[PDB]
Amino acid sequence: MQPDAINAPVTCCYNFTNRKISVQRLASYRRITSSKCPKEAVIFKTIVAKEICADPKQKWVQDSMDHLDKQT
Amino acid sequence: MQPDAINAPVTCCYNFTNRKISVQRLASYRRITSSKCPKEAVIFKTIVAKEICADPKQKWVQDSMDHLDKQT
Numbered sequence: 001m002q003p004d005a006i007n008a009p010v011t012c013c014y015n016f017t018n019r020k021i022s023v024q025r026l027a028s029y030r031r032i033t034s035s036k037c038p039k040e041a042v043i044f045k046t047i048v049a050k051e052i053c054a055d056p057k058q059k060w061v062q063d064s065m066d067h068l069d070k071q072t
Numbered sequence: 073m074q075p076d077a078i079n080a081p082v083t084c085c086y087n088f089t090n091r092k093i094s095v096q097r098l099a100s101y102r103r104i105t106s107s108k109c110p111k112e113a114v115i116f117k118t119i120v121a122k123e124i125c126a127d128p129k130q131k132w133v134q135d136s137m138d139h140l141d142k143q144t
Contacts, residue, residue, distance in 0.1 A: 007089040007124045009115050014108040017079045036086040043081050052079050 010034050013041035013053030020060040021052070023067045031056065031065070084109035085125035092132040093124065095139045103128070 012032060025046050032041040042054045042061055054061045085104055097118050104113040114126045114133055126133045 001118070001120060001122055004089065004122055004124050007087045007126075009083045009085050009104075009113075009123055009125055011081045011083045013079075013081050015079050017076070041081075050076060051081055052076055053081055 010036045011043075012037035013043060014038065016041070016053050016055045020058075021046070021054070021064075023064050026064060026068060029065055029068055082106050082108045083115075085113035085115065086110065087125055088113070088127040089124050093118070093126075093136070095136050098136055098140060101126075101137055101140055 012034070021044065027045050027047050027049070029042050029044045032043065040056050042056050042065060043051050044054055044064070045051050054064075056062060056065075083104070084106065093116065097120075098116055099119050099121075100117045102115050102117075104115065112128055114128050114137065116124050116126055116136065118124065126136075128134065
């Protein structure tokens with residue numbers, strides 16, 4: 001068990017949505033920090049609980065994270 | 073399948089455990105086959121709920137899959 005963490009699976013984004021998603025449709029997000037993934041990416045979780053990959057290089061993404069951060 | 077699903081994050085294996093894991097410590101497994109992932113892989117779930125990536129080209133992994141499949 002001990003070091004087996006080094007071998008766990010990693011969740012990554014390979015395809016991104018190109019359509020901006022209204023911030024009231026979004027519930028929360030997580031930014032991909034594993035270096036194993038091919039690219040920078042944000043996984044938004046929508047109000048209905050589906051997860052969608054977005055590109056943090058696009059402005060709407062950055063704003064959305066900022067909105068979600070102040071939201072309790 | 074609906075469009076959003078194409079943009080959903082994907083779970084893959086980038087690292088493969090090098091040490092053979094004893095079969096009594098294995099609860100289940102699932103194979104990775106998504107076209108987005110780098111290589112075919114097996115994710116073993118242990119009795120302690122740990123998830124580990126294992127290489128399907130090794131004999132012990134093929135053997136562990138048969139052991140798990142034999143049970144009903």
